[PDB]
């Protein structure tokens, strides 16, 4: 991903690599459920508001308090010396940060 | 330049046979006084056997619709698909239809077909229908077509 | 914390529309009171009523599941005045004291066939007082 | 991406547009279509995370308003009911509101917009909503430079059609949807709304739970069937079926959209394979069983399920044959579709029926062919599938108690269409009867050779059984097809028409004939216990059953001396035989419960619906006599449950009080030494 | 006796019970539960009933083009991005695919469109003018990119089958045809000439037979969903008549297509010559028509032993009403023009079993519906179908010749249906003569007060005294009229209600006798139905008029 002197096709190739081993599983879980808008009754469900403030300005699309129900991020260390077969279920763990 | 079949205009229902592979077309009959059962009267064999036609006429009175049936029960005309007719025996004077008594000709199912003096019921009534699938209901019933009356009463095809 | 009294009110009340007797009514049970009454309910209806009420679930409404819902509703004295109600509609005299010279008009009001002459009979014990006139007091006592 | 990142990225993408309350943007820097393919979808997110962000704020003003309005509602109801009387309610328009459904009350109290000012709210509750509304058009953009995400895509798109010729189509579509998207900032909440639910506190962890299983079952779609992706399927299925949220909100469920992803589970699997038979059977399985519970959760579930009624009319043969598969195959799931709702039976169509009709005719008129191949006996006709096809029928014409006229009429006029439905027995032609037939089906059941294949248990169908219940089957159905009793004393045509040709198509001897026949009883062995006859071979008390109502319903019971001679020939045996199965071991066999439930369920009904008859029956001293204490008898038995015995009580006070009193001193007899021990059975 | 009463305080007790069964207020109901209802009753009642328009500037900017001269262009003009839209909508139609798949984005910018283009109480005709050519301009906009391609490329690629998305292209369709645009006429010709295109008119023929008309069955099991208490959950009762509002666009693009007499056209759609294969769209809307009037018949056989027609019986006879009033235009614009192979065509076809048909439906409806008040505008309604169907009849005898087949076809339909015929001619002539009686003054004489609001009894006898009218004629206007217990009754509005709509479709039956009675001139058959037809044509007499010119054809010609 880093490098500046890679090839085209390998650099592509590289970075859909790394979007379907590790990403691309939870990315299409949260696109199936976009369309559904479950929230739930809390305290912080009534603290949101059309407007952060008294003036009538749109926020940042995106940032702000959303309390609407989304799919539960799961992830596996992927180590071979572990005989157990649980890791199998979820996507590799990646330092998303 | 084709004609149709019209009210108060004698006719005679012709059926077909094929019993041990020929073509043998056959006439219903029925003799007033007597046996009010109707017969067949063969005439393909013309050329030996004469016809007996005189028991064989039958005359077209009404042509009413099936709703105009159910109004009329419930209280020249050009006839079409899917409409009620009544049938007079031009010799007798007495109309088609089920006696609904079965003599058991090998079918519990089936009913006899006779002649009824009385003209008020539902038995003596006779639904026309298009047994050819270019024909459709309402479509004008020309002089020669291939048809399948089915008896109001009982919903049984003349058979 | 309902009146021992007002339960065998709702005694009478429960076997009012349990005909059969068997302490459930069934929607087509209930259904019958409605159309006695001019109502024309659809089955769906029918059955969207009872499930409301049926805490249990069976279909037909028992008398625990009945009492539950009479505390739903606040009938805490419109039983008496329904019955004060009945008292002042049923004089149409307005004297405050029904005779039994209305009482024939009433008996075609309701729809009941009983006789005139039985009426007055039954109305020298319905009147233990015996006013030949039933009043509020007279009334309650037959109720 | 929170917070201070997405402040970054998005200054990035514009920083005049986004910049916090020169440069350029990757939207003006002249980029490749593949690019601008991309930034596209970038910005179709923005909207969608807008819209989730304007879908919420709706969701937490209804909380304030919903609570101000229920109290508001709870006062005018007060101060209503304060002035009216409970007998009253029923009447008054004025409380028309309260007794209206909760839907059309809400949507008679939000009609504030306009000045027809029929909705009861008051003003200060009006101004919240007349508020609120309005600020959500000033965020939809619906009331100097862009300075919002809607006119930055709406100038942007414009100005790259205008600016270059776009080859590709899937850029040309991307850049118009989002245009009209941004032009159209209403239909995104007419769309989202209709998707949006709101859910308890208690319940978010089950919620969570039931849409991770609906999520891998929706994410099995793209993978093919397999063992693996059956396993998943089952196990998420099972999962989804133990929720509770399954239950309390089926409209969220709806929602959801579960039934059709169900559905096209089904429909890859069934339609993959067709000329190679259906692969995965328990699949099937397991989707029909799930379809059928979500029919039966509500009514609404079912409405949504009847509109694929006609799909799994043509995938209906999909495993009538095999056993165990009952109330898992399409054809289940289009009967609980249409099962006991009189809107959707109404609505159900004549070409559905003519399908099941021809299907039928089918099944009559040619053998079963995976049942040949394992070995049993060829015969013309097929019962296994037959049956079924008529209890799909009997589902569709009868609801509620009374016959849907409009369906019943069809069906009778199809099947008299196509007699091969019928059957050998009833063909017309070579006919041995009903009654042979079924002393016929009694012969094969008691024969091994014919019963069973003769070359796991429950797969062995026995075949003379199979004719029994298809030959009840068939009467069942033609009996609820029977007209209702009063279009039939006011005169409809076409309902004597219908009960006419039911009773050419029936005969009330064989009828007779049919209930005369007897059962087998469970006997007492050598060590004493008790050996049972099988169930699932031989003839059942249900076949008679089916018997009774068609003789009830079409022929009725109108006359002493027949009443008497069928009290004679055919209930009377019946009824002493389970007074006889009143011992304590005994009477828990499946013979004895089977015999009450059929008694208690269509016999004592109609002898107490036939009570008056039971006035002038002098001559007739002996069988009254012996039915009176038959009755009784059965009475004091202890298998009976609280409705049979109520019925038994009914029917004893019915013919005891038509009955004359010379006729009851016998009984007396018996009652003068068991009512003085004043047990519980003494009541009645 | 406490029993009885009890039975008296039980009735009073039932309603109770009852009504504290039925009463579920809506506070009793959880937080979410109404929080759920109120989000679906808020979306219905408030976001979906909002409304704003923004077509006509949405495509006033989308056809800007967008400074190209100023952009690095260097070569030709670059197509603006209402053309781009337009031939990405045209290419995804001419891709071949099995079916017409349905596409959300097509389906609402075509509505854009057609909104763009129509945008739509005395007016002066400086600005009718303006509304014409701002219309002209409008249509420009579209038809100037390729818009006339496009809808009948998806039309073609629709394969015959109903759906939104042809209902979607037939509306742009009428937008841009509004007006009888003959540009645009002229290049659908065109462009449908040099493709040689036959799945158009296959489809155009696919659509007409899956076209509904009215279903007695429908109609009978939603009635008894309504007696046993059930609520129409769809939003018309569609069941009855599924597409009323398709049919007609179907119909109106058609008569659009053919409005100016655009003979080619006209006669492009009987026969394509180029073609190899020829579909005939002037038969198709006959048998659709002869479809509708059994339909219409049906509900009259239906309708004829209940006393009063209901509200929904009522507005199913309305919308089946427009439906053929829309094909009786779209015949009329087809045959008019003297486009003799369109006249030789319907002569040739089922039209005159259509023609008996609604003879007989409309002879009796006026009868039946003029007794009743509550049934006015359907009334209207069946006298406006009763003139289109007239006007359709007169186009079906322009250009004749004496002693021509049309003629003699014509005749031997009236003959057909002389008794229903006969009917109307009565009718019109009853409520004809009534105006004369109203004016004349023995009327004057009964009121001479300047209000006329005259008694029922009064009216009565000024009927019996003017002798005109037959005792059956005299209780037909007295069930005809309806009056207070007053007995008072406003003449002024019963005469014109019951004469203008006779007073013009009978001068249109009045004409139509005339031109078979001349061009048809030794006929008994014709003469006995004048004879019938007498007192009509003598009242009409001062007000027709008759001209001879030389026609078109080359021959003498009478008007
Ligand atoms: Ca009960
Ligand atoms: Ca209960
Ligand atoms: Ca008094
Ligand atoms: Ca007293």
Known sequence: ?97 | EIQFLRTDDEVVLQCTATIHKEQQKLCLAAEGFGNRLCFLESTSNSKNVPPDLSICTFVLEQSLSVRALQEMLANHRTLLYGHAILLRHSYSGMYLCCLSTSRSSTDKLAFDVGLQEDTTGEACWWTIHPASKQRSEGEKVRVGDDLILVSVSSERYLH | ?143 | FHNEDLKHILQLIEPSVFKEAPKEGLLQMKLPEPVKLQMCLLLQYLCDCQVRHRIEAIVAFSDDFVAKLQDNQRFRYNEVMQALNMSAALTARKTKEFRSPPQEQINMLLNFKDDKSECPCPEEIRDQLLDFHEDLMTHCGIEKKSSTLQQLISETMVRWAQESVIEDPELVRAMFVLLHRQYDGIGGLVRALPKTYTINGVSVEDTINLLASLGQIRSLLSVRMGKEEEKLMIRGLGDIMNNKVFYQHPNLMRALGMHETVMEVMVNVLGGGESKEITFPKMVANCCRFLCYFCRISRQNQKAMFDHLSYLLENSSVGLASPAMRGSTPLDVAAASVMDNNELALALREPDLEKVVRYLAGCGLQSCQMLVSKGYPDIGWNPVEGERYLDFLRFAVFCNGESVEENANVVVRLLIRRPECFGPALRGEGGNGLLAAMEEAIKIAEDPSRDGPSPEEDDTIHMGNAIMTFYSALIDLLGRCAPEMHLIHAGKGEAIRIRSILRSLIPLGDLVGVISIAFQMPTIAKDGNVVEPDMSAGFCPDHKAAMVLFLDRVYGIEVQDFLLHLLEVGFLPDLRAAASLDTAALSATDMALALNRYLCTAVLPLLTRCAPLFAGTEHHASLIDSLLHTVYRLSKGCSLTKAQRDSIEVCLLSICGQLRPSMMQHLLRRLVFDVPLLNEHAKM | ?559
């Not at chain 3, 049970?29 to 009872?50: F, Y």
């Open chain 1, 1 to 97: 991903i880093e490098n500046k002197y890679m090839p085209g096709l390998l650099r592509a190739g590289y970075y859909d690599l790394l979007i379907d081993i590790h990403l691309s599983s939870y990315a299409t879980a949260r696109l199936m459920m976009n369309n559904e808008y479950i929230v739930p009754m809390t305290e912080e469900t009534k603290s949101i508001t059309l407007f952060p403030d008294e003036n009538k300005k749109h926020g940042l699309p995106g940032i702000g308090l959303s309390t609407s129900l989304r799919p539960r991020m799961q992830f596996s260390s992927p180590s071979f010396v572990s005989i157990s077969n649980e890791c199998y279920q979820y996507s590799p763990e990646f330092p998303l940060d």
């Open chain 5, 1 to 559: 006796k406490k029993a009885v009463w009890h039975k008296l305080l039980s009735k009073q007790r039932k309603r109770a019970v009852v009504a504290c069964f039925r009463m579920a207020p809506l506070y009793n109901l959880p937080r979410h539960r109404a929080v759920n209802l109120f989000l679906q009753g808020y979306e219905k009642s408030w976001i979906e009933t909002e409304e704003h328009y923004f077509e006509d500037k949405l495509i006033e900017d989308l056809a800007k083009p967008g400074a190209e001269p100023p952009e690095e262009d260097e070569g030709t003009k670059r197509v603006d991005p209402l053309h781009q839209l337009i031939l990405l909508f045209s290419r995804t139609a001419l891709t071949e695919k099995c079916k017409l798949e349905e596409d959300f984005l097509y389906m609402a910018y075509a509505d854009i469109m057609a909104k763009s283009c129509h945008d739509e109480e005395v007016k002066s005709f400086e600005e009718k003018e303006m509304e014409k050519q701002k219309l002209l301009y409008q249509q420009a906009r579209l038809h100037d990119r390729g818009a006339a391609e496009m809808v009948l490329q998806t039309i073609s690629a629709s394969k015959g089958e109903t759906g939104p998305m042809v209902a979607a292209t037939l509306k742009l369709g009428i937008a841009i045809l509004n007006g009888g645009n003959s540009t645009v006429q002229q290049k659908m010709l065109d462009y449908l000439k040099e493709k040689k295109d036959v799945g158009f008119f296959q489809s155009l023929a696919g659509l007409m037979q899956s076209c509904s008309v009215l279903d007695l069955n429908a109609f009978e099991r939603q009635n008894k969903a309504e007696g046993l208490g059930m609520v129409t959950e769809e939003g018309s009762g569609e069941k009855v008549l599924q597409d009323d509002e398709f049919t007609c666009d179907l119909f109106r693009f058609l008569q659009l297509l053919c409005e100016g007499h655009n003979s080619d056209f006209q006669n492009y759609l009987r026969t394509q010559t180029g073609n190899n294969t020829t579909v005939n769209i002037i038969i198709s809307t006959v048998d659709y028509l002869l479809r509708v009037q059994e339909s219409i018949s049906d509900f009259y056989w239906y309708y004829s032993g209940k006393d009063v027609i209901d509200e929904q019986g009522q507005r199913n006879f309305s919308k089946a009403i427009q439906v053929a009033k829309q094909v009786f235009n779209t015949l009329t614009e087809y045959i008019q023009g003297p486009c003799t192979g369109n006249q030789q065509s319907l002569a040739h076809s089922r039209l005159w079993d259509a023609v008996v048909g609604f003879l007989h439906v409309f002879a009796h409806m006026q009868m039946k519906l003029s007794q009743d008040s509550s049934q006015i505008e359907l009334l209207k309604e069946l006298m406006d179908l009763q003139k289109d169907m007239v006007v359709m009849l007169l186009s079906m005898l322009e250009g004749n010749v004496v002693n021509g087949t049309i003629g003699k076809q014509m005749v031997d339909m009236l003959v057909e249906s002389s008794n229903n015929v006969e009917m109307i001619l009565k009718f019109f002539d009853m409520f004809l003569k009534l105006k004369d009686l109203t004016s004349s003054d023995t009327f004057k004489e009964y009121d001479p007060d300047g209000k006329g609001v005259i008694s029922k009894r009064d009216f009565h006898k000024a009927m019996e005294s003017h002798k005109h009218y037959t005792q059956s004629e005299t209780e037909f206007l007295l069930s005809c009229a309806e009056t207070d217990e007053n007995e008072t009754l406003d003449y002024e509005e019963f005469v014109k209600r019951f004469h203008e709509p006779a007073k013009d479709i009978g001068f249109n039956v009045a004409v139509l006798l005339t031109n078979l009675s001349e061009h048809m001139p030794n006929d008994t058959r014709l003469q006995t139905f004048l004879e019938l037809a007498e007192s009509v044509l003598n009242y009409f007499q001062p007000f027709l008029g008759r001209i001879e010119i030389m026609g078109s054809a080359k021959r003498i010609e009478r008007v």
């Open chain 3, 1 to 143: 914390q309902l009146t021992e009294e007002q339960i065998a009110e709702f005694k009478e009340a429960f076997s009012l529309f349990d005909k059969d007797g068997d302490g459930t009514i069934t929607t087509k049970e209930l259904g019958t009171v409605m159309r006695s009454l001019g109502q024309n309910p659809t089955e769906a209806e029918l059955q969207d009523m009872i499930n409301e009420v049926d805490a249990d679930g069976n279909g037909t409404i028992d008398f625990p599941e009945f009492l539950t819902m009479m505390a739903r509703k606040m009938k805490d004295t419109d039983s008496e005045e329904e019955i004060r109600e009945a008292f002042r509609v049923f004089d149409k005299d307005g004297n405050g004291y029904i005779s039994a010279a209305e009482l024939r008009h009433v008996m075609t009001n309701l729809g009941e066939k009983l006789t005139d002459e039985e009426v007055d009979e039954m109305i020298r014990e319905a009147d233990i007082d015996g006013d030949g006139q039933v009043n509020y007091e007279e009334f309650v006592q037959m109720m």
